[PDB]
Amino acid sequence: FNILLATDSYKVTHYKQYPPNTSKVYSYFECREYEETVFYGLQYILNKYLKGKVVTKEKIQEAKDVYKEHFQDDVFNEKGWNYILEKYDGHLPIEIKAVPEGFVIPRGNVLFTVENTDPECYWLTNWIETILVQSWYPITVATNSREQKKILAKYLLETSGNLDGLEYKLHDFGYRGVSSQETAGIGASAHLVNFKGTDTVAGLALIKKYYGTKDPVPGYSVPAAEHSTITAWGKDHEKDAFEHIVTQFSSVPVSVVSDSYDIYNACEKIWGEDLRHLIVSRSTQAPLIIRPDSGNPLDTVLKVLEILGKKFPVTENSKGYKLLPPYLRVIQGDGVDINTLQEIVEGMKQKMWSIENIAFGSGGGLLQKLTRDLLNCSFKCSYVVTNGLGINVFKDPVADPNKRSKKGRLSLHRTPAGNFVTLEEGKGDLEEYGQDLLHTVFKNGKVTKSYSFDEIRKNAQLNI
Amino acid sequence: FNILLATDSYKVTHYKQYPPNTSKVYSYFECREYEETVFYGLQYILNKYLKGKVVTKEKIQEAKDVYKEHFQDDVFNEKGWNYILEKYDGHLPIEIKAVPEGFVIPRGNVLFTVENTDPECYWLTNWIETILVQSWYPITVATNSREQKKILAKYLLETSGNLDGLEYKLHDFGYRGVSSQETAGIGASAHLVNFKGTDTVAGLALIKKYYGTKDPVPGYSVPAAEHSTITAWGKDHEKDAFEHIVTQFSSVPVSVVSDSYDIYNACEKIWGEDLRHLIVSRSTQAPLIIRPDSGNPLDTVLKVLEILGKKFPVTENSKGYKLLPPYLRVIQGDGVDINTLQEIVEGMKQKMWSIENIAFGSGGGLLQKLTRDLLNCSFKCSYVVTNGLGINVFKDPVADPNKRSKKGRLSLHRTPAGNFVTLEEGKGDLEEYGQDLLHTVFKNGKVTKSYSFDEIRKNAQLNI
Numbered sequence: 021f022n023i024l025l026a027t028d029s030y031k032v033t034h035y036k037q038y039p040p041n042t043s044k045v046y047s048y049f050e051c052r053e054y055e056e057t058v059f060y061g062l063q064y065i066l067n068k069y070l071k072g073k074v075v076t077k078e079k080i081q082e083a084k085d086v087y088k089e090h091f092q093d094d095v096f097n098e099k100g101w102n103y104i105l106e107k108y109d110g111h112l113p114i115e116i117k118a119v120p121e122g123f124v125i126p127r128g129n130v131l132f133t134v135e136n137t138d139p140e141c142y143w144l145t146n147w148i149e150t151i152l153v154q155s156w157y158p159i160t161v162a163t164n165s166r167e168q169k170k171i172l173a174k175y176l177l178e179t180s181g182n183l184d185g186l187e188y189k190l191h192d193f194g195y196r197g198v199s200s201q202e203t204a205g206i207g208a209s210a211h212l213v214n215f216k217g218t219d220t221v222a223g224l225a226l227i228k229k230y231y232g233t234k235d236p237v238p239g240y241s242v243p244a245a246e247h248s249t250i251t252a253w254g255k256d257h258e259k260d261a262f263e264h265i266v267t268q269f270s271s272v273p274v275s276v277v278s279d280s281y282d283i284y285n286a287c288e289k290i291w292g293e294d295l296r297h298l299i300v301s302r303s304t305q306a307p308l309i310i311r312p313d314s315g316n317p318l319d320t321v322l323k324v325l326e327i328l329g330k331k332f333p334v335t336e337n338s339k340g341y342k343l344l345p346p347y348l349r350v351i352q353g354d355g356v357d358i359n360t361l362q363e364i365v366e367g368m369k370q371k372m373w374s375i376e377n378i379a380f381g382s383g384g385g386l387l388q389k390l391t392r393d394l395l396n397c398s399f400k401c402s403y404v405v406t407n408g409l410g411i412n413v414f415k416d417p418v419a420d421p422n423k424r425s426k427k428g429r430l431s432l433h434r435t436p437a438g439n440f441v442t443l444e445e446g447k448g449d450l451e452e453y454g455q456d457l458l459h460t461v462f463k464n465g466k467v468t469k470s471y472s473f474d475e476i477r478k479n480a481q482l483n484i
Numbered sequence: 485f486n487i488l489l490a491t492d493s494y495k496v497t498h499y500k501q502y503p504p505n506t507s508k509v510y511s512y513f514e515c516r517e518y519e520e521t522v523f524y525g526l527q528y529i530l531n532k533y534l535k536g537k538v539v540t541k542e543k544i545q546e547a548k549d550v551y552k553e554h555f556q557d558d559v560f561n562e563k564g565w566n567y568i569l570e571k572y573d574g575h576l577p578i579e580i581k582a583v584p585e586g587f588v589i590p591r592g593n594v595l596f597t598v599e600n601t602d603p604e605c606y607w608l609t610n611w612i613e614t615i616l617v618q619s620w621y622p623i624t625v626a627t628n629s630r631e632q633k634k635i636l637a638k639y640l641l642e643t644s645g646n647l648d649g650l651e652y653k654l655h656d657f658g659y660r661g662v663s664s665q666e667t668a669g670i671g672a673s674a675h676l677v678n679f680k681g682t683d684t685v686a687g688l689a690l691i692k693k694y695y696g697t698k699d700p701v702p703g704y705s706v707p708a709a710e711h712s713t714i715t716a717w718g719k720d721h722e723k724d725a726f727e728h729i730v731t732q733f734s735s736v737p738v739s740v741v742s743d744s745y746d747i748y749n750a751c752e753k754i755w756g757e758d759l760r761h762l763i764v765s766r767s768t769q770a771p772l773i774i775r776p777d778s779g780n781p782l783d784t785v786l787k788v789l790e791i792l793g794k795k796f797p798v799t800e801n802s803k804g805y806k807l808l809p810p811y812l813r814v815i816q817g818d819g820v821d822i823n824t825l826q827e828i829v830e831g832m833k834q835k836m837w838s839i840e841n842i843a844f845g846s847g848g849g850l851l852q853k854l855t856r857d858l859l860n861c862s863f864k865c866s867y868v869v870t871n872g873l874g875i876n877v878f879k880d881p882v883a884d885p886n887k888r889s890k891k892g893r894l895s896l897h898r899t900p901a902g903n904f905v906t907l908e909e910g911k912g913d914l915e916e917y918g919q920d921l922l923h924t925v926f927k928n929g930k931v932t933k934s935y936s937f938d939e940i941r942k943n944a945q946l947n948i
């Protein structure tokens with residue numbers, strides 16, 4: 021990895037574009053005004069990409085050679101980079117101040133700021149925009165996941181009177197449906213801020229290496245079938261597949277994909293009659309989890325519950341909602357995103373089924389079907405020093421007021437009523453508003469403040 | 485990287501779920517029935533992740549300890565992985581056959597097949613489903629990028645009579661808007677199958693390492709401003725910023741973001757009047773490229789053109805369309821995806837503006853706003869051998885015939901009319917359709933067939 025090759029190409033040319041005699045460029049990241057965002061993932065970038073000796077004689081040469089061909093021109097700032105190598109032993113003269121990871125912050129507030137700490141390095145502040153803005157991704161995943169958790173909490177509370185098991189209601193199925201191995205780990209770690217169930221194993225090592233938990237692991241799974249492990253038995257032997265599988269995993273939870281041929285037949289006749297005897301004998305700690313995987317997600321879930329309720333003893337909980345026996349549950353893991361998840365719990369509630377009965381698995385909806393656009397994650401220069409004079413800078417495009425950026429030096433504060441406010445134009449120095457919530461997390465090649473994954477989970481808790 | 489920890493959790497439990505005495509699991513990947521897909525990206529995965537000694541004693545131990553905690557139970561196949569280490573020095577006993585990279589294939593056809601080459605490693609075929617299915621991403625980027633090339637080619641030909649400069653008409657802006665560094669390199673590389681313009685520098689090294697080009701680099705850029713390099717001059721000094729930047733880059737093309745305060749004022753008054761003398765003097769190979777970045781993309785592009793058309797000498801080309809002078813161009817880099825690109829070129833054509841005048845930059849639309857759903861990329865078991873008996877396996881969910889999978893051993897063939905057909909149930913062996921178009925690209929830890937990026941580009945060409 022070479023930081024000199026980890027920027028947008030045009031930024032290579034920006035050192036020649038700033039006003040002459042500029043000693044300071046100061047920039048900030050916000051999710052421009054999903055009303056509130058979980059700030060998560062910066063610590064990963066700081067440690068993996070930004071800290072320590074990130075410049076070498078070899079990396080400068082490599083970059084020089086690539087850019088000469090990429091631009092067909094000599095534009096690369098070799099002197100600037102060499103200056104960092106010789107004076108700071110290749111450590112970046114940058115200070116980054118950030119809100120604590122896990123914090124839940126309303127849109128349109130500063131989340132972190134970046135400035136250069138040596139006047140020679142005015143151009144470096146925005147060199148690293150590209151790499152830092154990629155924080156949009158863990159922010160957005162953590163945020164969207166938490167939003168699903170609110171929906172789940174609401175309906176679980178209403179239909180059952182408590183939140184037991186909430187942490188296990190939205191399982192990460194996204195490993196194959198993301199764009200890379202690196203994304204898999206990042207995105208899976210962001211979902212674990214809110215939940216504990218994951219099949220995206222890559223999340224575990226990222227968390228262990230960059231954040232840390234008191235528990236051996238941040239996330240957990242159970243045995244579960246796929247179509248290959250059912251269909252391999254042959255079309256006439258789905259029942260043999262089911263029987264083999266539940267018997268192999270008789271004393272832990274086991275999920276069994278039941279739609280290879282006919283989900284409704286599988287529920288009513290295979291599980292509901294042929295194999296009923298192997299299900300009703302199961303422990304509460306070791307249920308059968310039936311998994312539909314096709315059809316309209318709402319129609320399929322409701323029809324499956326209807327079938328099961330006629331084949332197995334249903335109770336009615338203290339809230340008046342129907343509850344399957346504790347050895348039998350359902351997981352819907354097809355076509356699940358925040359919208360369909362809402363439609364399913366609502367449809368269940370309508371038909372008087374407790375949310376205790378259901379869990380969800382989500383792949384692309386959880387980890388891939390998200391864009392920098394969703395929270396308007398944006399990094400802009402708000403302050404420069406030119407000829408020893410600070411000036412407040414911003415954009416304000418005529419046709420789009422939503423793209424107006426903030427002016428001057430920024431600070432984030434608690435308001436008297438307990439909300440958040442971003443003070444502009446260095447007004448935080450007036451001290452009318454208690455201390456700045458941003459803390460120095462990076463300074464001159466060193467990570468200066470870290471959060472464990474346990475702290476982050478606490479910071480990102482739901483209200484209730 | 486540890487391949488033992490690079491699968492979906494549930495797959496760790498699958499060795500215990502297949503029928504007893506299963507000696508072969510054979511699986512295939514398709515983009516289930518955007519009618520044609522560019523096959524691209526498998527070779528990256530084969531080389532980075534799958535080839536060579538990928539199993540060590542330390543990797544087995546690491547995986548054992550993680551899964552013990554992750555499952556709260558000892559499901560992990562330590563013996564199976566140890567077998568591979570001991571018998572094959574950690575090389576995967578797997579055969580992969582694939583269509584050549586860059587090939588453009590209709591949906592619903594076999595793109596690659598995976599099978600185990602040792603009876604003991606029957607569980608390995610689908611272990612690596614998760615890693616291989618991630619090929620959806622380069623496939624989808626390359627396909628969506630090529631679909632945009634078809635639109636640009638159509639309108640450039642209609643409005644100008646040729647395709648000169650087509651390969652520079654869609655510029656990759658997506659480095660900051662993807663989910664990780666790895667994703668950036670992969671996705672930028674896929675766009676470069678079709679185009680030559682990129683700011684996602686990560687794509688360059690990937691191609692050089694994994695594919696190779698005759699040219700020193702596969703992609704190119706030019707100097708360009710961002711809002712920090714305009715706004716840093718102070719709101720009253722936008723003109724000074726503009727003058728400085730174009731003079732710094734007076735003999736190469738330069739893109740200058742023009743909407744910091746008022747895009748229409750910048751075009752009409754600043755470029756059109758105050759600084760006009762510094763633009764009309766420029767070379768045909770060093771145009772000023774004016775960049776709007778806000779507002780309704782179509783309305784903004786049309787108004788920008790109307791403004792410039794009144795300030796600069798417009799000509800009418802041989803097709804009857806309006807053409808700006810060669811030292812002046814426009815690039816629309818905001819809100820660009822396949823739909824808005826189509827809207828802009830059609831609206832331009834409608835108002836009699838040649839597509840010669842316009843280029844596009846696309847970020848998330850190009851590299852992030854894409855999902856496994858778009859092409860229905862899917863991996864499924866189609867054939868197994870159990871008790872020495874080969875059987876054709878498949879899924880066929882009652883509520884979704886689209887998800888029916890293919891049966892038996894598969895082959896890809898040319899039809900008598902020269903189209904593509906995938907033969908099922910080993911029927912390729914009858915030789916009624918000539919030889920299988922898939923080639924063995926991986927066998928027993930080795931990459932056995934490779935393509936340079938130049939071969940891939942040639943395979944991926946448009947009809948014209």
Ligand SMILES: O=P(O)(O)OC[C@H]1O[C@H](OP(=O)(O)OP(=O)(O)O)[C@H](O)[C@@H]1O
Nearest residue numbers: 197313353354355382383384385856862
């Ligand atoms: O985030 P998503 O992309 O929605 O992932 C969830 C889906 O993934 C798996 O199916 P598979 O990989 O076989 O895809 P398919 O169900 O569409 O065939 C799983 O059995 C779910 O159907």
Ligand SMILES: O=P(O)(O)OC[C@H]1O[C@H](OP(=O)(O)OP(=O)(O)O)[C@H](O)[C@@H]1O
Nearest residue numbers: 398657661777817818819846847848849
């Ligand atoms: O295709 P996209 O993913 O949108 O990327 C392209 C956009 O990215 C940059 O803006 P910035 O990073 O400031 O985003 P913003 O214009 O939304 O603020 C650029 O100046 C374009 O507006």
Ligand SMILES: NC(=O)c1ccccc1
Nearest residue numbers: 193194219244275492494
């Ligand atoms: N555990 C599962 O059922 C699962 C299915 C598909 C993808 C990931 C996980």
Ligand SMILES: NC(=O)c1ccccc1
Nearest residue numbers: 028030657658683708739
């Ligand atoms: N070169 C550019 O104008 C650009 C803009 C935004 C993102 C990447 C590149």
